[PDB]
Amino acid sequence: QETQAVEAGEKTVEQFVQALNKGDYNKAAEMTSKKAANKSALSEKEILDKYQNIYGAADVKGLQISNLKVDKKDDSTYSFSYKAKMNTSLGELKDLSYKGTLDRNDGQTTINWQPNLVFPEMEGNDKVSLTTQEAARGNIIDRNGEPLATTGKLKQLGVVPSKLGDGGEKTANIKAIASSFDLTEDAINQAISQSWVQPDYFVPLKIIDGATPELPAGATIQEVDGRYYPLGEAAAQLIGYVGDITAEDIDKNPELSSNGKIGRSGLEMAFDKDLRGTTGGKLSITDADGVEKKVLIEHEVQNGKDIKLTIDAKAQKTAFDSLGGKAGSTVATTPKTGDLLALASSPSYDPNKMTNGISQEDYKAYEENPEQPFISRFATGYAPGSTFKMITAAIGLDNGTIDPNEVLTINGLKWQKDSSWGSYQVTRVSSDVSQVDLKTALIYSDNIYTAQETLKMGEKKFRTGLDKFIFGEDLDLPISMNPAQISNEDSFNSDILLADTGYGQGELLINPIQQAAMYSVFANNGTLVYPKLIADKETKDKKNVIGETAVQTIVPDLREVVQDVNGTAHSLSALGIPLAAKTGTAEIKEKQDVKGKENSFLFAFNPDNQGYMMVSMLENKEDDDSATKRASELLQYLNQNYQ
Template sequence: MKKGWAVFAAFFLIVIFLSGCRDKVTPEERLAKYLGHWNNGEFADMYSNYLNEETKDTYGKKGFVERQEKLQKDLGIENVEVTYTKPAKDIEWDSEKPASFPIQVKMETVAGPVEFEKTMTLVYETNDEIEDWFVEWDSSFIFPELGEKDTIRISTSTFARGEILDRNGLPIAVNGTGYEIGIVPGKFTDDEKKAELTELLGTTAKYIDSQLNQSWVKPDYFVPIAKVSNNDIPLLEKLAEIPGVTRKETPMREYPYGEALSHLSGFIGVITAEQLEKHKDEGYTESDLIGRQGLERLLEDRLRGENGIRIYIDKAEEGAEAVTVAERPAVDGETVSLTIDAQLQKQTYQAMRGEAGTSAAVNPKTGETLTLVSSPGFNPTEFMLGISGERYKALETNPLKPLFNRFTASYAPGSTLKPITATIGLEAGTLNPTEGLTINGKTWQKDASWGDYKVTRVHAEAPNPIDLNKALVYSDNIYFAQQALDMGSKTFVEGLKRFGFDEEIPFTYGMKPSQISNEGTIGSQGQLADTSFGQGEMLTNILHLASMYEVFLTEGLMYKPTLFLEEEDAQVWKEGLVSAKNASIIRTSLRNVVVDGFAQVANLPSVPLAGKTGTAELKAASEDKGRENGFFVTYNSENPDFILAMMIEGVEDNGGSAYVAELVSRVFAPTGENQ
């Protein structure tokens, strides 16, 4: 019996011994679990269960847990990957000696990746009545160069916004300088001048007082009040005359062509709440500048660039240099070059004399857009600096609508459509260019079924018979109405669609498509007649109108209009629109319109222009009834470097389309000729 008990006791002791051996954890196993928590950012578990007593006493929970959690958030630390180099398989661990392991640390931060290697040591000790392996830790495991009293800091460097240049490298929207206008309080002693200053700067006396009454202000300090463009010379001169008012140069976006390119360039401004919400995940802040209109807005993603950011250790030792942990350099925005010829744009804008209207010029050999003008324009800098409510209201209520971008809109093209109508008839075989029609009187209708509707022509004096050349020279509505009836609405509509009507204009900048009618169809003979000479419900975009005239110079090709130099030239949008023979017929008549017709004001001695005038009566809105828009589309018939289309509103009392032809001729005329 005693022997049995002895055997049982021995067996029991062996089981206990073996169990104890299985439960004894190696330092490698403890390290692996610790690194698992580290990779998951579980700093509280690391602190409570894995750090040795000396580490806890030195750093405390705040120095270990809270600091690392804050750094993870502030530095944007993610994708942490900590590994270790496995020891030899046959190693025997001695609890009397520390166990050391090489570890490798990788992470992503807001300033880029960080990688380093360290040696981590575990010691065997009793911690909270538990005997185990525990980690010895110090701040260098956050970053190797980080001392206990050092500080981790972040600095940013701003990018330079990308610039917009014209085809010749001339500046359209660039980073330049302006002036910050300020007051030196000790010299600004004349209270009567305060009212003058508020008026000049568009601010209030209350605001000026609030600036001057700030706690840091001293009599000889510069107190900023407003910013002014460096090209606003009259304003700067007036400000310079006020004692105590001075200025400092400051970085500023510049728009050298001002009003002439305002609708195309647009402007930047402080980001709106709506834009901030839209771009909330893209790093914008409430004080950032962003494209607010025009190409500045359209190209925001390309122009913006990316701020640089640097994470560095500010060493506690006096005189010690800061240590960079990670750095992402600032990336400047792109420079974008346009097909626009800024000088031609300025010349065209000035030729329009501030009249309400629009114009576009294209290169007929490439489809490049050389000008896009909306007149009148506005001062982009005024909006960039923050326009006052009073000033904005004045612009908004201006009857000439300087804030309305006319080159994106569409208008009834009037008689400028007639060459297109003729082309459709020629290609369909329904129009014989040499066949003359006998047309008498000022009005015509097909038959009594038309009721009160009649087609009216302006020049009843045109000598019969009226062939295509005379019809274009005298701009005879009746001739084109009869030709449209001969070809029929189906042929005419199909022809217009081949020219790009009723489809999106393939252009980077959003343009309203040209339309045949509100429904895209022609429902009556009267509507067919009206549409044949660019009236009815037809509307045409000015850029599209200029592009359509390319076919007469390219023998049937119409190119996709481009805006950026990086785009491929001569991308065919439409082809086979007119034969070489028929294109030649139209070209001859377009030259005759200027030589013999009612665009003779554009018959320059040294520049042989060819083109077509057009007048469109406004019928839609009652307040516009009786008003007319005038058009002229033209090119140099011997050297057609560009086709220019221009529309001027309200020409009914100003010479009609001949007035527009005179304005356009100023763009082509050499200095002193027809000026």
């Protein structure tokens, strides 16, 4: 029964470590011997309190042991020893050498508990102290060092209920404050009326940006430090925001500062580790006289690193403002390198109001806006619309299905292969041109031409051309997204779905960033250049996506999308800048709608220098609205600064 008792001790030690690992300090204490010399040093409840105070002070998480040995030191007392490691608010404590003894009384093996089982070299009434220094959060900057996310001094407006009034003069000063700072009068009274307020306390109200006006009776400006976003809502979905760190955050990662901020969405969350730095300080053991006897962990505070983006701050603000608060998104790149210059999504939310404590109704307004400003539309999969005719055309030119000079005879406004298609009709906007070749189809955006050429091409050849793109690939970007898909399954099993896919509808799902990746072939002679968001990242590409001949056939036609008097983007010819473009619509029918909606698209790049490329979309567009109707300002800027 000697080998069985060694095994019972090994079991006891492992159960002890498990109860500590799980934070159940009570169960760990109920596995100890009685309080006595050469037994347990403290009682059960005293062991619970010792672990709860000490392990809680250092935020000890996850105890793991190794090299466990249980031998035999006595007839009723067995000696054990093991290595161990744990995680604390100052990092990982490794190579901890624990030792002790067990007790075999009756058929129960208990642990002769000692303070050396809290931390290795603790005796009797030793204490533990933890000193920490907060790490300052890093900055997020654009391609020219402009601040996108930075921490700075903010002016916090607040009122003291004492210096206010008693009744009549109180209500007067309140309304004066509510008018002098664009605040609700009921909000000021609701603020000073919460349970935490004392009559002399400073009750904060608002973070005032700009210049402080006149301060009426009771109003006082107080400087505080906090995160600040200069572009505001214009970059909210991309940058994100930070919020107060909670107890649940600490239970998940103790190396966070329980007093600091954590990124909740966007890049602030994607690069939270790099931006937050690492806490500095010292975890030490002292004797009962406060004399330090062992330093367990000690390292200096390392501030957070900066993150430099390919983003252009002026392009980001121009791209967002051009959407007029309507639902949509705009992506701008330098297509030869993939530098993402702008990632705008509209409508948007205020990230400064978000991180400076937002009202609960103001949050609900964001959450119940039917346009849903919280959506990162540049990372959300959409059907690319009839813009996708470029890709289907290039595939058709590569496999010899499409002769650029062959003229299909197309009569009327709607077409279908036969009657089996039922209510599905491929539609075009004009019946004035019945002799349609490739150049005419691109200039006028003729879906009937594309649907017929797609059908003639066939599913196998269509997919062989599509598989050369980035469908199914996870882009190497710090933005949450799903890979693009051609359709739901590997086979269309439907001529309708095949034709619908031909001009960018069907079950296609491609987010705006993935779209700009695919469309970059027309600025790199058939080579796909993967988009890039981090400035120092190396350019990556994929070669022979479409044929070099196909690019040389299509780009001249895309020039005429702008230059021709009846080209779908002819209003951009006014710019007087070299433009190759392609408009598009995607027909959407969602359950809540009786009538169908459509998304408006624009693709455009500089065909002379290949310096920029843009893909804008309007989601559920209103009547008399389009993406190309809003692209003049951004196109002028991109042409001037990116050649």
